[PDB]
Design a protein around this ligand. Structure first.
Ligand code: NA
Lengths: 498, 437
């Protein structure tokens, strides 16, 4: 062919997999090649809406556009076409609720984010009425505003027309995964996975089914609820208009469970912790649903060909969001800065901005800084912020120890920081494993899709393939350690007390 | 006129050869190792640079000179010379807390409280002197011969001024020593010996109007000696309660001829004129305007007055700036700085506010101890905001610069009753978290 005589072109590669990671504060799309390597990434923020202190909302059209654009972006940066994608995986910030019209797909309201605290009062009504018991028992969760069920009650009760249209069978409820699936397939598929369903307060974690009593209690019509599947299942096929190709959606799991999968935490006792705006630690607990006595959540780690693997989770609401406060709020300014702090000074930050999660579950606790001195500056605030990440992880793990009887795996952008992870090993007095790919949440769901599509290896292969970048080891003087640990316990008490 | 003036602050030393005819300042290093400390020399040099740079802006135009000082601040130096054995341990310093608690444990606190009008607390000089002698290498062996001079800043400053000729205190500064009987006006044998403080070390306690020697290009007689906080009152036509606002905040209410306090306050000497000693009740706050300095210098998030107005009114942010413990009326030397209530939203405006507000809250806490036992100046009392906010919060009027005493402004509460109870509850809540065990 004239003139391809001296013309160079690259062909193909095979086994490409697209993971969409619809996060709290941005959306990412990653293409993984047939070697499970990252080929191309799109990333894009969307607006955080705060209509009142403690209230948090996303525009779901904006989240939608962010998925469309981020996808196109990763594919182009990958040097391929949408037609080269064997399959898609979806993960998502959990608990976040969207309600939308089953016919037009128009949401009736902004998405109410997992961070949102607006139903505190309604959760108190239910608690006083003797109700937390069945929820805890059925669900593994608590009657806190964190979960979906309470937020969905709020939309049905406060958006005009909502309760009515819902009862007619005209509205769809979804966590963010269901919202994406619905839109990717152009309305064809109305579904979630067991892990996202776990998080709603509506689902029975033992029966693997929407729970009649809980839905009745919250006055949610069973109709509005999507079908619940395994994490690797058939979630439909991409609407061909969106990317110019029909791609099967084959992997879906909540972001913290996707990271759990991506860190190969498949066996009982294995544990991971993801560091983002919040921090979320999950312990693989095997076939058994461990009921915590130490203020942890019981949840579904994943459900795989009909089989549910369970987990214990600690959920820290403010982790990275603290340094984000330092940098954008106070603008007082990060491990670089933090290593420069005066050791003589003892400053603690308890970032209880709108309450405290595990293991405290104190929705009335507020932000507090301690131990300031006439000289304390940015450096020490910055240290207090990163150390608060450490100390809260610690308290999660100590609670896990009391619930269960094996080296901490760690991911999220925050951990590329050698100073922070070293400081983490120290305070834990335990070793810390940091992987080669930190985007563990994307890979976990990319694996689930890959493995079902058959272009990627099975569970045990993927598991032994887990690649360590770095084991951190504790190298802090014990005396020093005692001092740091005692100062934090005293910061905590001062923050929790009436 | 023509009287010289030396305001030996904690951060700086200001001068006024006063109408006014002198005005100069030079700042010095707050060496804070764990604790607070000044360089004794940097003081002697700064004082002798603040004199020759306030009188040029001759050597014999001043008839006398007048010394006021940061109180309680201790220095040990030699008799036959005057060499500082250690740094000035400063009134701010918390180091001797444990030693005080050893003393409270042996049951000594009541004899001190009774003879002294103060408390077993790191704030005052006696325990700092004790720390000197046990901690400096064989310094008591020095002191035990008479080779050491104790004395507060007035004495360090009246010493070197008179070329080692005069070694005196006044009775106000003497109240602050925790070694002095405030009724009998003497160094107490039991107090000093409990402290193992050899009386040879100690200076002659003179009057506020007395003959404290000739200076070193003139031969001028030191004839004025009280504490900045007592001479605050005598600057403040209160000879019959003033509140000073600089780095700390200090308030004293004239008691007339000894109110053995019931509300964690101080029994001190407002003055002693010709032997006839007038006492006041004291409320004393370690950090006030230093809280805003910290913002600008420590954290450097502010570049107070206007910003405090800019602050989101949905935000309940509070600051108990216990950088070095809390004075009146908590007397917790183990308390540290704490900030409460931060949100994603909290920015430089809300800290600034909380820090200006802090002085108002702490003020209030003193008067409520005063209006239970029984008018403000200072540099940081300039902004109308702060004073208005102070009148609002105290729910009481406040006045800002002999009937010869002149006013500028009296202040009035343009604040709602429930908004005040809201802002009051937050403080008290902030205070309780900072103080609990
Ligand atoms: Na290629």
């Amino acid at each position: 062919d004239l003139g391809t005589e001296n013309l160079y072109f690259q062909s193909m590669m095979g086994g490409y997999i697209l993971a969409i990671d619809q996060g709290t504060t941005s959306t990412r799309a990653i293409v993984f090649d047939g070697n499970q390597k990252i080929a191309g990434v799109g990333q894009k923020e969307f607006k955080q809406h705060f209509p009142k202190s403690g209230w948090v909302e996303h525009d779901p059209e904006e989240i939608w556009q962010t998925v469309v654009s981020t996808v196109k972006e990763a594919i182009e940066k990958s040097g391929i076409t949408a037609n080269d994608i064997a399959a898609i995986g979806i993960t998502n910030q959990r608990e976040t609720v969207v309600v939308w019209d089953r016919e037009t797909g128009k949401p009736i309201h902004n998405a109410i984010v997992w961070q949102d605290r607006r139903t505190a009062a309604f959760c108190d009504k239910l608690k006083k009425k003797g109700l937390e018991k069945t929820f805890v028992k059925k669900t593994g969760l608590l009657l806190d505003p964190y979960f979906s069920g309470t937020k969905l009650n709020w939309l049905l009760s406060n958006v005009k027309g909502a309760q009515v249209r819902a009862a007619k069978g005209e509205l769809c409820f979804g966590t963010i995964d269901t919202f994406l699936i619905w839109r990717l397939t152009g309305g064809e598929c109305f579904c979630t996975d067991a892990t996202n369903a776990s998080r709603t307060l509506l689902y029975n974690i033992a029966e693997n089914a929407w729970d009649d009593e809980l839905t009745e209690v919250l006055r949610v019509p069973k109709e509005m609820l999507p079908e619940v599947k395994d994490c690797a299942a058939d979630f439909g096929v991409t609407d061909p208009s969106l990317f110019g190709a029909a791609i099967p959606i084959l992997g879906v799991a909540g972001d913290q469970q996707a990271a759990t999968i991506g860190q190969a935490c498949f066996k009982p006792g294995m544990l991971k912790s993801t560091y983002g705006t919040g921090c979320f630690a999950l312990l693989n607990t095997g076939k058994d649903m461990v009921r915590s006595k130490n203020r942890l959540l019981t949840t579904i780690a994943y459900r795989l060909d009909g089989e549910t693997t369970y987990a214990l989770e600690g959920s820290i609401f403010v982790a990275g969001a603290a340094v984000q406060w330092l940098r954008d709020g106070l603008k007082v300014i990060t491990g670089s800065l933090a290593e420069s702090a005066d050791p003589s000074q003892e400053v603690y930050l308890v970032p209880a901005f709108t309450g405290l999660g595990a293991p405290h579950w104190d929705p009335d606790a507020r932000g507090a800084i301690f131990g300031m001195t006439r000289n304390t500056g940015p450096a020490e605030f910055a240290r207090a912020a990163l150390e608060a990440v450490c100390y809260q992880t610690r308290d999660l793990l100590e609670a896990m120890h009391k619930d269960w009887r094996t080296v901490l795996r760690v991911d999220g952008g925050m951990v590329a920081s050698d100073w922070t992870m070293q400081r983490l090993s120290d305070l834990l007095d335990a070793p810390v494993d940091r992987p080669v790919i930190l985007e563990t949440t994307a890979l976990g769901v990319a694996w689930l899709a890959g493995s079902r599509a058959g272009v990627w290896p099975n569970q045990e292969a993927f598991a032994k393939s887990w690649a360590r970048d770095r084991r951190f080891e504790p190298h802090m003087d014990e005396a020093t350690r005692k001092v740091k640990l005692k100062g934090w316990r005293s910061a905590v008490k001062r923050t929790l007390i009436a």
